[PDB]
Symmetry: D2
Subunit: 165 residues, 4 copies
């Protein structure tokens, strides 16, 4: 084989792990690395850690630093693992950067942490890696076994899924 894929990690629920000192979940090590370790990949794939800050908390400065970091990648196929609560805002922001116009940028994450039983994370990672390799240049959210247009997408808290507007 495939075109080279670069993966950026911005934390979120997918990466949550339990810590005794917190008596609860923190943003841990990136779960995408745990999934790809056993995927027996053939192709060129490399992972870059960007942030473990609470995704809810992302400022314009955080989003800007992500856009610049993704621009540092010569790869044209990009996966960004991310919190779901501000995924639409990040995706809309990246969609407005002319610097990224030639890249396929896919955001994904998980509704349940990878390190918790019953997680969507491994499926989402496989689906998003294929989406990043296969879709035309642009910025997408890959969740729920489908591809969302960030400009026409919202997270619906009642449904527990992204939906079209």
């Amino acid at each position: 084989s495939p075109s080279p894929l670069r993966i950026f990690t911005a934390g979120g629920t997918i990466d949550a792990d339990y810590r005794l000192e917190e008596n609860g979940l923190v943003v841990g090590d990136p779960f995408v690395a745990e999934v790809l370790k056993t995927a027996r990949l053939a192709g060129a794939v490399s992972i870059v850690a960007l942030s473990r800050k609470d995704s809810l908390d992302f400022t314009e400065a955080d989003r800007e630093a992500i856009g610049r970091a993704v621009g540092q990648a010569v790869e044209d196929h990009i996966l960004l693992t991310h919190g779901t609560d501000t995924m639409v805002e990040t995706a809309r922001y990246l969609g407005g950067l002319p610097e990224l116009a030639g890249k396929t940028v896919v955001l994904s994450g998980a509704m349940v942490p990878g390190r918790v039983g019953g997680s969507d994370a491994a499926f989402n990672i496989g689906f998003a890696c294929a989406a990043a390799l296969m879709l035309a240049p642009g910025v997408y959210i890959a969740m729920h076994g489908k591809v969302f247009d960030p400009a026409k997408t919202r997270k619906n808290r009642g449904l527990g899924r992204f939906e079209p507007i």
Copy 2:
């Protein structure tokens, strides 16, 4: 009308390592229930996927598969299958004119989904996205990449598909 999520993908299960499970009576692995059903149960799909059983066995068998695939209404098809004869099945489906408008992807796992350290969940997400996003044809989706069956072979001892140059 209120939005209706489509179910554009149909999955057929032909068994294979991906579906292996432990049985006390055999004191070993048999082909068990389809593991792709377990992955999709927790994938929080926006739509749904019709999963249909074709075989749990380890020329006529390939013909029954072509018939089931060719009869499907869906234009996006995933067949979970053993890796030992996946190339043979894929090459046979490749020659059926009935499939000309369909994206047909074969996949599976080198490690059973029910065994620790399995590629299965990743493979299922990657293959579902491949079946949705690739142009019509017949493909093997494994190792985070897409293989042309006519130009692919299985290496038994390394648990990998590899090109024929």
Copy 3:
């Protein structure tokens, strides 16, 4: 086979599970039921749900209701799954009830939720079930592969383990 064992659940970390609506862990269904489902038990074992309230929050009234509930059991072998933060206080309280003097009462739980990867919970449950069947009448904490005397025990936050005083 063994003498009949009664298991009471008072929640705690062992039982934590992820909820989308909380965006984090809540006290969920009792994890001991998930472990015993695959233990292939021979003996008489039954589970009773007592509480899912935060164990940190337990009042004297909560502890008293637990002591009375355990007294309702005709079984002489008792496992109580519980939060670690107030486990010593509950165990010291039960140790002072003449009503329970003829019973073996073991408290246990987990430093990491059963539903999180890398959990001590399944081992703790097996070890505590044996302790409840095998120890002389009295009240114990079974954690870390050993038996603690509640009167001479504390949880050491720095160590992440119970230790003797």
Copy 4:
């Protein structure tokens, strides 16, 4: 002096279903690395457990086991073992005067620890507690209960130990 946690228990591994793992080359399960080591890695033990390898094979073999067990300094011994011949091993150890002061418990799993839905973690906790708490002798600890080897048999098709009345 500052408290020193003892390591009163030694574990010997003779293989068996508990340790089975998937190998691509065999296209099936072999006896792999000892699963009891994986369980104890996350058990947050106050002490430690010396784990020693005796066999990974499927009269002389039983003699080597008696020798290793009889040479141990520890008075509390757990032997992880296949369930098919556990009774034979246990009966043989039962007749060795060298073991008269030792609590020796055999255990294992009807489902491999590396397969979903395994009894192994529970069995290991239950058996470690049995090895610490039972009076000297030789025992089989399975199904959440203690068996007298002289009066026990393995039922192959049900994956259970059962009494001889």
